[PDB]
Write a protein that binds this DNA or RNA. Structure first.
Ligand code: MG
Ligand code: MG
Ligand code: MG
Ligand code: MG
Ligand code: MG
Ligand code: MG
Ligand code: MG
Ligand code: MG
Ligand code: MG
Ligand code: MG
Ligand code: MG
Ligand code: MG
Ligand code: MG
Ligand code: MG
Ligand code: MG
Ligand code: MG
Ligand code: MG
Ligand code: MG
Ligand code: MG
Ligand code: MG
Ligand code: MG
Ligand code: MG
Ligand code: MG
Ligand code: MG
Ligand code: MG
Ligand code: MG
Ligand code: MG
Ligand code: MG
Ligand code: MG
Ligand code: MG
Ligand code: MG
Ligand code: MG
Ligand code: MG
Ligand code: MG
Ligand code: MG
Ligand code: MG
Ligand code: MG
Ligand code: MG
Ligand code: MG
Ligand code: MG
Ligand code: MG
Ligand code: MG
Ligand code: MG
Ligand code: MG
Ligand code: MG
Ligand code: MG
Ligand code: MG
Ligand code: MG
Ligand code: MG
Lengths: 82, 119
RNA sequence: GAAAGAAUUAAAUUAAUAUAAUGGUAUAACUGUGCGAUAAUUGUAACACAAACGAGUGAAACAAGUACGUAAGUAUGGCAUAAUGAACAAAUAACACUGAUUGUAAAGGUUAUUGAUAACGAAUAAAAGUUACGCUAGGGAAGGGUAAUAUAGCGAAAGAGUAGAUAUUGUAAGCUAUGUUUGCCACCUUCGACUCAACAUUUCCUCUUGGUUGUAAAAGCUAAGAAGGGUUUGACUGUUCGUCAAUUAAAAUGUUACGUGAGUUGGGUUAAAUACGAUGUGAAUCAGUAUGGUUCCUAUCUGCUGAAGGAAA
RNA sequence: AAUAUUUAAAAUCAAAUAUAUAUAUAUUUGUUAAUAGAUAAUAUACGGAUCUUAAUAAUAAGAAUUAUUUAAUUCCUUGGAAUAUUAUAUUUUAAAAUAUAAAUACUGAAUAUCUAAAUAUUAUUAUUAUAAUAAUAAUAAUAUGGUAAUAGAACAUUUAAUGAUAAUAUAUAUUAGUUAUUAAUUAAUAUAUGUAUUAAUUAAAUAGAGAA
RNA sequence: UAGCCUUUAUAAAUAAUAAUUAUUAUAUAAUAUAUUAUAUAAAGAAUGGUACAGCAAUUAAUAUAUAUUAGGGAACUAGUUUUUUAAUAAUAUUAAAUCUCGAAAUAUUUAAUUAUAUAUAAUAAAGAGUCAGAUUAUGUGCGAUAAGGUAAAUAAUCUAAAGGGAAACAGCCCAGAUUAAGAUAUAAAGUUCCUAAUAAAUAAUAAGUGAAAUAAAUAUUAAAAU
RNA sequence: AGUAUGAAAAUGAUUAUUUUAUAAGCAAUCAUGAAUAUAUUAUAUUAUAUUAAUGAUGUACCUUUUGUAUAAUGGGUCAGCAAGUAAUUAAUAUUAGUAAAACAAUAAGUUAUAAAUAAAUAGAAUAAUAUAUAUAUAUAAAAAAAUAUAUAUUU
């Protein structure tokens, strides 16, 4: 099981301890998705930043490449070269 | 006070709705955290994900902060909370010993659910 | 059952600690007593604390020696945290390291010790004032905020009012408004007169009206509406103000960069000259007094007063 | 009805959540309003218009204020189900029945994603010719606001060294194109010159001016 | 000079940052009244003395038809009672920058573990700039619980930060501009028109109260509950 | 203050195109009609260029500051000129040459090759990593603090 955590809010008005926690967690920019294997340690860290973050549990995690592939929009065309 | 910080003493309807939504989101986050921990513990014992999700007896979190957050006396949910504590902080130097939450700096990030028993 | 001992429990650190205050101290760091008077000793001190550097603090250990203790051991001054000062230059000893041709020496070094720089990281062995005759470089390293005060109001009403707190008056304390006074802050570096005034209303006169055992009448007093019109001339003083004289229906109070100096004035305030009283050894100085005494501007834009041309009628 | 308090969910009751559970225990939530008081000087001053609804009568308006809420309404556990609504189509007699849909409120940043481009680093490739390299191109990721400041890389200008070429050329100017463009290049036009101290690499600088 | 910034590197390198575990108690199960495992509860290893709370000791304040210690009056024949005056005791009730006997949270902070490594610490060799700061929020000192005041503490922003909101806006609410593109999610803030975007529900107001800068004691009129 | 040349700009007058006499502010940018001009591939329902219909956004620049649209500094406009340079040295770094030596070759010198110590006649494994050795303090010699030296080839 994995927490899919997302940095919903910015770190602009945020004090330095909370910023440091966010950095440790692995979230860079706003809206940058990170999957974390569930445990007590990561849960407590997430609780510490509960108002900046959106968490949701998952069966499986996704690698960055997989996430990118999921994101990619449908090109509404099929090329045929001649 | 020649510089004009034109901040109204009370919130609009739309502001209040947003605040409520934010409060609900933090409760949801907490719920997710507890749920994931429970699922993990079920897996450790030796159940599948689906089986863990089904389980009648949900495991309560052992770490302290999480356990406190779970308690409504310490950290109440938005549905539990009073109208007043959603939209008014305690401020000892204000008249009424109360102040709009919107007047708190970084109120959109910072959480503040519980006021004192009689203030 | 009794005596004696060992004591334990409770309380206490409120006494006492060389000395401030704080922390600690009865397991005593406090107190008494024997010995002693040594460790208020000598070389290396890691490692920490603190910490810009300079310094500061605790200190295991190794080596030499000493005092107490049967021993275990303890002592590198004081229960702790203040009790202090760099270099340079001199001075005194010890060291045996250098010895400007060699030898001595001198002189320098090492080690220990000495006195102060209190503006206390100490500029020199050694330095105060004055300028309105001043000069250069720079900095700004009434308006704005406030409303203690001031002015005005409100609530409550002790108390005056021949009797009755609320006709009229309204202690001290309470709640406000104003930005008209005297302050405070430091974002921001001229008083009066003449002339012309515009605005406010918290109304002085004129109009309407409520109350007035304290409206008989007439004069008043107090309150509500009301800014249309009106609201002074002289003697004194630079004065606003104030005192008075003579009037007036009344001689209201403000705001406007305490309106108005590219509109006038320049009496006050103000620099150069001079004198007086006081202050100073003095040059000179003054919340002093007096005589004298320096800014100018053809209007580009805004605005206002008038007057034309062009124009879409 | 009258007198006198209080304006309260602490207690109390009601409702909801969590532990054994038709109950107990613990927690959470629910208890007035209006007016007057009210007030200065260029000019009304919610930013302005303007906002409080009304039958007859609308295929139609009825806070745009304050307080508690929702995203049609009601149960069940974000989700489904039922209910009526609204719109539409069909069938029947402007109505009725059947069915399809809408229920994801929306606006909103130079936020994030997508969509492409650039540079830098990390990790994989491909092509072409310290090949464990270089150049170019892919993919995935992270980064790219900036005063004082630090670091890296370029360009314009002028001189010195080397140096083809040529009026069908070169230089300068103007105009319009081109290349991710302080620069250079193409074409046209103009004026000069029988011609670049030219391209390129080095060396250097009286090497770039809206600020004294 | 240190603090904060930059460049280039170094490893028998993770020492950095964040959180968890650590404790106490209960119930159940298994071994020998103890230990281990599981579950739950508890602001949960160590350090602390602010808020709060409290009146212990210290310093202060109040009351007793209470008691004692004396004094001033007073009635009968020096003894005695009452109305007392202070102190002390007793009992009850109170507060303080330099009182804390109770006592948080935040905090300081340790080991291992996990997560951050396209990331941190440390060290080495070198370059700086800066030492006028401002506002907002919270807790204080000064001021008058005055100042766009002053002095520092913590956090953020501005400083050096453009973009959206707050009418206009250095410091507030969101959010960090490599260059475009403009389909989708949005933040704060909004959705009658000006102006991009709206429909509902239940109450209350009638004062234009109010509608993004809340003005007090008090008065009058209602309204609930007892 | 040479001589030629000179569509360099500021600046003036005039003409052409276009907009402008009911509209208000850094005079630009973006949207967007219209009018005009040019266009030897406008085939057009075309393309570029010029031009304050109309709409939206838009508080010159610098300096100095906690902070400036500021009514703080400075500039009338344009042209030319106007500011981290040199010498003698020292320390770092990068590369290149040579390398236990380098530079220089006449010798002399500088740096390196050994660490110390105020200084002196002292100076690096007696049988291997420091537990050995060297120096300074101390000493009979060790120990003790500090730094340095040693595990086919010297750095
Ligand atoms: Mg003593
Ligand atoms: Mg004491
Ligand atoms: Mg330290
Ligand atoms: Mg030191
Ligand atoms: Mg002693
Ligand atoms: Mg001297
Ligand atoms: Mg001699
Ligand atoms: Mg001094
Ligand atoms: Mg000094
Ligand atoms: Mg000095
Ligand atoms: Mg002196
Ligand atoms: Mg004089
Ligand atoms: Mg003022
Ligand atoms: Mg009386
Ligand atoms: Mg009074
Ligand atoms: Mg009369
Ligand atoms: Mg009046
Ligand atoms: Mg009239
Ligand atoms: Mg006269
Ligand atoms: Mg005046
Ligand atoms: Mg004037
Ligand atoms: Mg003037
Ligand atoms: Mg004369
Ligand atoms: Mg309750
Ligand atoms: Mg007004
Ligand atoms: Mg508005
Ligand atoms: Mg972006
Ligand atoms: Mg950058
Ligand atoms: Mg030049
Ligand atoms: Mg120039
Ligand atoms: Mg320029
Ligand atoms: Mg420095
Ligand atoms: Mg670690
Ligand atoms: Mg204190
Ligand atoms: Mg205690
Ligand atoms: Mg300073
Ligand atoms: Mg200030
Ligand atoms: Mg600055
Ligand atoms: Mg900004
Ligand atoms: Mg920043
Ligand atoms: Mg960025
Ligand atoms: Mg109104
Ligand atoms: Mg208002
Ligand atoms: Mg017209
Ligand atoms: Mg005009
Ligand atoms: Mg001006
Ligand atoms: Mg200016
Ligand atoms: Mg000028
Ligand atoms: Mg010796």
């Amino acid at each position: 099981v994995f927490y899919k955590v997302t940095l919903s809010r910015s770190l602009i008005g945020v004090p330095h301890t909370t910023k440091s926690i966010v950095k440790s967690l692995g979230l860079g920019k706003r809206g940058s998705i990170v999957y974390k294997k569930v445990n007590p340690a990561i849960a407590g860290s997430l609780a510490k930043v509960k108002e900046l973050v959106k968490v949701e549990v998952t069966e499986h995690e996704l690698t960055p490449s997989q996430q990118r592939e999921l994101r990619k929009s449908n090109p509404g065309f099929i090329v045929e070269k001649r | 006070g020649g510089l004009l910080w034109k901040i109204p003493w009370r919130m609009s309807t739309h502001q209040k709705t947003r605040q409520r939504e934010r409060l609900r989101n933090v409760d949801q986050v907490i719920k997710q955290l507890t749920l994931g921990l429970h699922v993990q513990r079920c897996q450790d014992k030796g159940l599948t994900y689906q089986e863990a999700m089904e389980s009648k007896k949900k495991y309560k979190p052992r770490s302290k902060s999480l356990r406190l957050l779970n308690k409504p006396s310490v950290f109440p949910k938005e549905n539990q909370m009073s109208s007043k504590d959603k939209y008014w902080t305690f401020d000892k130097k204000a008249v009424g010993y109360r102040k709009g939450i919107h007047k708190v700096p970084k109120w959109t990030k910072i959480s503040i659910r519980k006021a004192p028993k009689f203030f």
